[PDB]
Ligand binder design. Sequence first.
Ligand SMILES: [Zn+2]
Ligand SMILES: [Zn+2]
Ligand SMILES: [Zn+2]
Ligand SMILES: [Zn+2]
Ligand SMILES: [Zn+2]
Ligand SMILES: [Zn+2]
Ligand SMILES: [Zn+2]
Ligand SMILES: [Zn+2]
Lengths: 484, 242, 484
Amino acid sequence: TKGLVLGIYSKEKEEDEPQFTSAGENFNKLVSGKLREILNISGPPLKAGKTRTFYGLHEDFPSVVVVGLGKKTAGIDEQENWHEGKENIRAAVAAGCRQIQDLEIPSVEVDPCGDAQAAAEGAVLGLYEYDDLKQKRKVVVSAKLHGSEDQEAWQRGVLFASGQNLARRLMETPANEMTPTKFAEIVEENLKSASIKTDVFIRPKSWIEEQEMGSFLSVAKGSEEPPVFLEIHYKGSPNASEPPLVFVGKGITFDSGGISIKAAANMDLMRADMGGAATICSAIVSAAKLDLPINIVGLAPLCENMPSGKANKPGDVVRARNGKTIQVDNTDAEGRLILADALCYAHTFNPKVIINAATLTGAMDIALGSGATGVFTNSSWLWNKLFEASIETGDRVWRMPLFEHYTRQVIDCQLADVNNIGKYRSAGACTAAAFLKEFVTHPKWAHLDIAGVMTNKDEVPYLRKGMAGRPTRTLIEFLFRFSQ
Amino acid sequence: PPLVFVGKGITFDSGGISIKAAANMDLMRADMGGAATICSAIVSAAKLDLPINIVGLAPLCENMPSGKANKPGDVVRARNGKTIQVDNTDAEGRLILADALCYAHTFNPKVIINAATLTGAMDIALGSGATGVFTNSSWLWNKLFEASIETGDRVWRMPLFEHYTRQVIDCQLADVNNIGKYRSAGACTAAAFLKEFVTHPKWAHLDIAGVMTNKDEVPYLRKGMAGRPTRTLIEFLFRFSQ
Amino acid sequence: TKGLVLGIYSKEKEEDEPQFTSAGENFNKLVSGKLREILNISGPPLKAGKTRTFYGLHEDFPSVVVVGLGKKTAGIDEQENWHEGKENIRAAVAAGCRQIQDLEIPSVEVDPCGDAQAAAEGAVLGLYEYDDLKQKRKVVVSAKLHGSEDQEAWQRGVLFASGQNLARRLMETPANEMTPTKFAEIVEENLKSASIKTDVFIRPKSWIEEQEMGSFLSVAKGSEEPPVFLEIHYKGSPNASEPPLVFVGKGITFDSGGISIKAAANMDLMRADMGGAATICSAIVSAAKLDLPINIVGLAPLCENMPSGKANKPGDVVRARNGKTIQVDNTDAEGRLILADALCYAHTFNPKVIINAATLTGAMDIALGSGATGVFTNSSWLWNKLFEASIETGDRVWRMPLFEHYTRQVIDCQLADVNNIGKYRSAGACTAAAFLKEFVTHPKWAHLDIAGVMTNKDEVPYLRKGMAGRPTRTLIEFLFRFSQ
Ligand SMILES: [Zn+2]
Ligand SMILES: [Zn+2]
Ligand SMILES: [Zn+2]
Ligand SMILES: [Zn+2]
Ligand SMILES: [Zn+2]
Ligand SMILES: [Zn+2]
Ligand SMILES: [Zn+2]
Ligand SMILES: [Zn+2]
């Protein structure tokens, strides 16, 4: 019927016993001390992220899962660059919800754990699973707030987590279903449901040609799947003329590498090479849901990178919208090609800031793995804003260098203005970033290389194995704070 | 109390049983760059007669394959009593550093700074643009960063997160594994391995693998071994002494 | 304090509710129906291998773990070639014991589940972990039979499982600790504790040289670690002159591949290249513990395979004890070299049967993986005996071919009588077997290639991740039945 998730903290030195949250304390009282009694009988105390289940304590809650929240006053961890208490809550609540789901319980009430937004994030991110294409599926669990005192915060958590889950769905869906057109249609419907103060333009190939986006076009042509340039507007500012914030995302729905073909092992994960587009578009959907008082534009060039008799050939020179020529030495360095055109187009909006996201390089994965998203930016103010937002969400960012040292290695080009792969194999994420900078003149630009945080195995406790949708929540938080 | 510097001194690294590829293996004669830079920095500090006490520690040896060599899977005991599963014999720098870092604590130092041409991952990460610095002290990061602005021999901070530690203490036979669970973030997991042998509050690990050589990146250095970031270390010491 | 593991079966069509075992039924009665009541409250029924924990049902058992046993009458599964009921019990009991251990309970009583030997095997194999070299260790759990009616069978299970766990320990231990000498000393002490009717001879290099075992010696020389030829005798037959059964095991304590050096990835697992020696020696220790009325001889050539200035060089020709010359084309095909000499020596005992085991080829792993041990034999009677024993133990065997087709590919040799690697890359396990057959004239010989069952991830539910010690129990069962 109905399950209940309650939290308990680690015992502090002067306490005689570990303390329940307010809800746990109230429930124990409701059952005349039976919860504390049974917890004591069960043995060792619950530590952070651990769970234990007690049956039959109340007729309304046949299964009660108690979860360890760790130290009650855990705040910002100076060494980890995140709010520890929030992370403990997300992990603990996710673990509790997965136990409720294993017991095949369709609905669960969740203890706010002193921070309803974090509790909601743990439950909603934790229960998520992409199973539309399977016969065998786990029970669908409906999680709601236990109590009625922390509603806005709980709902805020549901909203943030839902945005990330939308990104996860888009990334996880196989490329034959999640084509450029399909991705555009799903984003279009989600944005329109979020707010009527939106406009969506799924720009066709003819428009792309009119816009002289030769770099983007060169990538798309190898495949039979039609390319599209998704342009979305959210008019949240009270002043329609207020300069917008522009987000740009790499939308390669499937990357085979092209003529510079990839190895077979785990190439299926490349269905998520559109993660950059997924995260920035989902962030905008969420911003619209929150009705943030700001104008935002989202740009996402979308296409496949396939080998064929029409595909990009190593050595080919293409002309970007801005007139710059690019020597395509490696057709698998295609994300930067489509981004060159989208970044150029972004300047036409005279934006306040330009932020792009892309599952750009394997080098980024070798550099930081799934620990944090690499951020390249020409603005310390912007770096700081993204960094502060990440401490709150727990979806960490780490700064990477934008030095001429790297630029020199990409403009040293045999046939053109810029080469699409560096002179050497070193610092691949840095030279890719340098390539992108040659198409940016804006003073507040940030490039997020999310290749290393594309998937999750078990690193983030509250995300099941699969595409991660990171760092969608950090982007939403940045926008929220920016709007305030 | 002295400042303690520690340097990886592998005079030649063939990789051992987990043998390296032949191409450009000659550059491994510089796998003692960590020892070279910290020892040279101390020589210079002495020349300048800086008013500070400094201790330099440099474990030195070769890593070669033979009938007596480390075998993948072997478990060894560090000076501190911790056991280490040697899954890859080419991840040897962290093995010799574990013992030197333990010994460093005996001096009750003010700070502990180690340097090592530790991982190819660092090279893939930042190349020769800057030395990667892993530190549990923002004060120390800042001091090294400011010194680097002056010398031009740049440093860039890399993360010391439990996220990476988890991947090296998840070990089949011992307390810590000498290579991570996955291939991602090699410089970060190597740093995490080193941290398991450090309890000091002001420690910095400099992975100089990417700045080991110079082609033409630094205009004033001819092609060859670079000796970076020796000047940044000297500057740090000078300012520290003042 | 004390935990309890109880089993419950899957409900049969005409039953109103799933049936507990006799012990589960008795415990429920003891607590006035409280176990059934709480199990019903907890939800969906327990299926095979699943577990659920109930707290505070009895003062003597604060934690009771109920485990799903599947269908009560599950017997031999025609398609899987094993006794299904026994497999269900081993898996269920192991899962239950791991839950008790997670709760940090030091002692547990285990329901015999209608088959005490299988229950004991699940508990003892299930709880095993090699942690001698770690600071952090799980609680040591002492498992005993619940009740006093099935003692001999429970103890038989403990004995079989202990034999396998000894093999696992020997295989898991790092090679710098588990050297040829150390392995010999550990086996020596275990055999002597098992019975006084034993003799152990840790033969030194001088003896090996006297025995003209040039093939074995050629492998050992590349390393600084002294080689030994372990010879063990168990005189269990009433007639001292009764011909013995001879077991032979490949004891490469560490295999780097030698000059034909292995790749670095996962080379640490080669510390278990002595699995052949581990399994046959452990089987003999167990046979001695059981005091089987038969004479058995165990032979295990032990050494390392390392690269150095003295190592085997590709193309070198060596002379086996039997006078045959061998062209060592690949130094990593060393197991067959040391086995050639041990198999020759085995004939001197005028044995009834000769069975050898070896983690011999990667081809075997590509062929059957961890599903079953590959068995090559010139005797269908022997194949059948091993096959029947495996149905009982669940540690499956599968027959592989001994055809001249494969022999032709190894005697087609440029410099010698036989080549240590075949003409082609196909059928690697089959040509390796053919190589071994050139050193056997006995009419009842079986070669077990255990390379594919060297480790366990999660395939065998009752074995934690690590070296498996398979198929030790099948060997013990074969010996038991043979003795009867
Ligand atoms: Zn997708
Ligand atoms: Zn690509
Ligand atoms: Zn791509
Ligand atoms: Zn090395
Ligand atoms: Zn090295
Ligand atoms: Zn071993
Ligand atoms: Zn071999
Ligand atoms: Zn071998």
